[PDB]
Symmetry: C2
Subunit: 556 residues, 2 copies
């Protein structure tokens, strides 16, 4: 593979093999009182500051230098320009990758097959703005003349996670907006329990599906329509309660949706990078189009930082480089994202898709199989919840787990004169401090002696109280989680993911890995009907199907 053959990578790996057991956070900080200044970035977006402190990582100036050299050697900057210039960097599908055009507030032309994409982008945005205005003003009414109180987004993967995570994160800005609901699972309980809490007369459904033939999404949509029509009866009423986010005008018309209410996007918009397009309609409806533009503007700001900042001080790039260090040198399988913010409770889940579906690849640009690790397993839970759930393993377990700790300085709810956020902040800081410092046998011993522990009891319990520490973390702190700031943060990670993919020489923008499961599922569907034994698959699949048919009747 390209990466393994890179001289800069080889240089990095040789340094690692020689000075690995030399890297100790406690000692690094004790020897360099200016470590924080040397390994941290402070970004002023003019709408809040972003501090990216990567000083608690197992790195030195030499390591960072070699890492930056690896990025240059792998052509990170050239690839970046190709992305922004509209070139088909999604080589397996032969398409451009332009989620950056979706939020290109400067409106500088971006060509695709010699044609500027911006006019179309702004056309859809204008349509979104108009629609959001009417629904929020109460001008758009249901079939019985009532205003919309609830908006239901139906989609899977990228047509679901992004909008859901953002509306959850910007909940405080939804004043004067309709309630939003997200239905994604084909599991019938999802649409069912959602519909049970809604009134057909004041509900607006958003069907998100490029092709408008997506099995899960369309099945849910048809279930929603049957439910609606059961109340409305009149088919022409569907046009007042259903809109589509796609490009299939024919199927959209067939469903009963008014064509002028079809918000399209393009093939250069990846699902896991689509919240910035028409897919984000529910976002705009919930918090208003103005806040939606703020969201886009934050991303655009981060897009520029990524493009004009030298690699050595480039946030997305350094975040990606640090991950390559832990993944390809320390051999860490996972990456934890721990935001200390309840509104961001689905941030980690969102990037679980953005990162994993982008970089969970094994075939390089030249068709060669990688001979090294690629995308890591991303996971996490928001601050203090995760801390009281699985931190025991991060502190005293056996796995090395790079962790990103995020938090806004200003809270959306400064209740009790800021008492809650104070404690939240203190824990945010204490956890990375502990993770790095740990507690030695001697330090633990002193504590146990002070507790008046028996000489014998002290020696028995002592080892259990030792924290080996030396566990690396990133601390990302931003002024306040506003729509603009959230846009900047999401874009930052999108570009981190982009850099790592280029370094690994994989295609972060295709997803051929989903085809097999879909193919095999279609074959099993017709076999589930009936009580006849199934024997067309392997013994397990067969046995599972027959157990299912047996228990179908079981009364419990």
């Amino acid at each position: 593979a390209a990466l393994t053959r890179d001289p800069q990578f080889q240089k990095l790996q040789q340094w690692y093999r020689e000075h690995r057991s030399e890297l100790n956070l406690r000692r690094l900080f004790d020897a360099n009182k200016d470590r924080f200044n040397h390994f941290s970035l402070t970004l002023n977006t003019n709408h809040g500051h972003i501090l990216v402190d990567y000083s608690k990582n197992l790195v030195t100036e030499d390591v960072m230098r070699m890492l930056v050299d690896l990025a240059k050697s792998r052509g990170v900057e050239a690839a970046r320009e190709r992305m922004f210039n509209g070139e088909k960097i999604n080589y397996t599908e032969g398409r451009a990758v332009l989620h950056v055009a979706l939020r290109n507030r400067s409106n500088t032309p971006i060509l695709v097959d010699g044609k500027d994409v911006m006019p179309e982008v702004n056309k859809v945005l204008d349509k979104m703005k108009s629609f959001c205005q009417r629904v929020r003003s109460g001008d758009w009414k249901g079939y019985t003349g009532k205003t919309i109180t609830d908006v239901i987004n139906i989609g899977i993967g990228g047509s679901d996670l992004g909008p859901l995570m953002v509306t959850e994160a910007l909940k405080p800005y939804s004043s004067g907006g309709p309630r939003v609901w997200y239905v994604s699972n084909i599991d019938g309980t999802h649409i069912a329990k959602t519909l049970a809490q809604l009134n057909p007369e004041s509900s607006l459904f958003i069907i998100a599906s490029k092709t408008f033939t997506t099995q899960e999404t369309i099945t849910n949509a048809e279930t929603a329509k049957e439910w609606f029509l059961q109340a409305a009866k009149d088919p022409s009423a569907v046009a007042k309660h259903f809109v589509a986010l796609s490009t299939n005008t024919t199927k959209v018309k067939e469903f009963g949706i008014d064509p002028q209410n079809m918000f399209e996007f393009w093939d250069w918009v990846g699902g896991r990078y689509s919240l910035w397009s028409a897919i984000g309609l529910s976002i705009a409806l919930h918090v208003g189009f103005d806040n939606f533009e703020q969201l886009l503007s934050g991303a655009h700001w981060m897009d520029q930082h990524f493009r004009t900042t030298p690699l050595e001080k480039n946030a997305p790039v350094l975040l990606a480089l640090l991950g390559i260090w832990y993944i390809n040198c320390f051999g860490c399988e996972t990456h934890a994202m721990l935001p200390y913010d309840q509104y961001l409770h689905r941030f980690a889940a969102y990037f679980q898709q953005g990162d994993m579906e982008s970089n969970g690849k094994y075939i390089t640009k030249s068709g060669t199989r990688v001979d090294h690790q690629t995308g890591p397993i991303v996971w996490g839970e928001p601050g203090t919840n995760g801390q009281h759930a699985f931190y025991q393993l991060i502190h005293q377990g056996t796995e090395m787990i790079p962790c990103d700790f995020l938090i806004p300085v200003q809270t959306q709810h400064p209740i009790r004169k800021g008492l809650h956020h104070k404690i939240l902040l203190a824990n945010f800081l204490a956890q990375t401090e502990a993770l790095m410092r740990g507690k030695s046998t001697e330090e633990a011993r002193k504590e146990l002696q002070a507790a008046g522990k028996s000489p014998e009891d002290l020696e028995r319990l002592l080892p259990h109280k030792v924290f080996e520490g030396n566990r690396p973390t990133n601390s990302i702190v931003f002024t306040k989680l506003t729509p603009f700031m959230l846009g900047a943060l999401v874009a930052m990670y999108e570009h981190k993911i982009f850099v790592q993919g280029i370094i690994w020489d994989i295609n972060s923008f295709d997803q051929w890995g989903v085809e097999l499961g879909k193919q095999l599922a279609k074959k099993i569907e017709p076999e589930l009907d009936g009580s006849a034994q199934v024997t067309s698959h392997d013994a397990s699949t067969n046995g599972l199907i027959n157990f299912i048919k047996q228990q179908r009747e079981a009364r419990v």
Copy 2:
């Protein structure tokens, strides 16, 4: 470490090194027509069947035999009896481990320090029963005489996760019960956004905290009381709207709660194993005490299965052993739990604590440091949501990830004549089939040719469409997700965790790993107050705090 020195373990490790490149699922099945029958267990709980199919695992008759020999060699059965008999197996804290006592429906005496624990267990259950009766019936009234419409649970970690996951999973059984709310994050937006939607006249708060001094929990509790008294004014009104799940009678009195409304539990009840105790009060209030008893009954049935079943056919034991195989021989860092059920959307999250906080240890019983891996990183998202988010990596990524696929045969919402559930089931089945089978280059080439792909396009696309497969999974299918069945499934994993811990020779029931973080946070708290620069910590902690103080005043 005991494990490494174990003869049986060494035998397994040796076999692994010799036959690893010989383990291939396609061949294994093609070579054994009875593979499903040989590697699957069907349990009849009398309230539904459970099929634990572990045939899609990289294992053979010999491996399973060696694994069971490992379980015997490591003394799994003796350790189990010690737990059930009330001995102090939580050796670092000198305590018994008796969550099995909590659901001991048979009421068989279980002694701790010479006293049967059951009478007290049942005393609390009866109090819970009476309270739920009165609250749900409407007999229990607020300070203005209204009936309780909302129940708010306030607790962290083990006093939140269990009840939340269970009430979410059993939502269908909550008809006639009040709505339940879970507040756990010290982050003020949690209690703030929750209180903004409640009426002080019909809201009942449950303060879950053993010591009743837990910082996060008591802070949220005091904030809720302040909000409550704001409207009620009369401090004696608190007794009609706040109850406690603890043993500190004094602190509960001071708060303003009626002592007769303090539901207690004991030190042999681990937080991450407490939903079966008074901690589960919110569960009982939401779905009724009858359903709570079924839940307990389900777990009780599984406890018996675990205690009376020979190892070779013991579900918890087998699951535990398969994990030891992937973790200590294959070197897998994670374990994915993927239930194809939206109601179980918080199932993986629950065991993320149950498993990780239990086995994320590194000091053995002899006080010696482990020289092998222990607890894995548990993660996941429910069925089809996760499938459309990160399966790309599971199918074509670079890391090996053991996965547990779970699903109920009968759905709680058989809408559209079971159409949704049919598709859900087809995907549950097809995914494990695909993970195992994969798609060869030859098969992929034929598809591309049949699709009429160009010779140029074919060669370029070909390698990207190959699925290496041979990825192991467990498929756990159960008749229906009823209160009883859920109890059984949760208990099954609790015991799997117990078995793994004994084999690793660690303590699955303590959690010393949380102290350092809490100590360092207490020290930072006062330092955040005021405008002075902090210089008392390492440079990073100092820098982060000074950035916070600076941005604290920023207007954005």
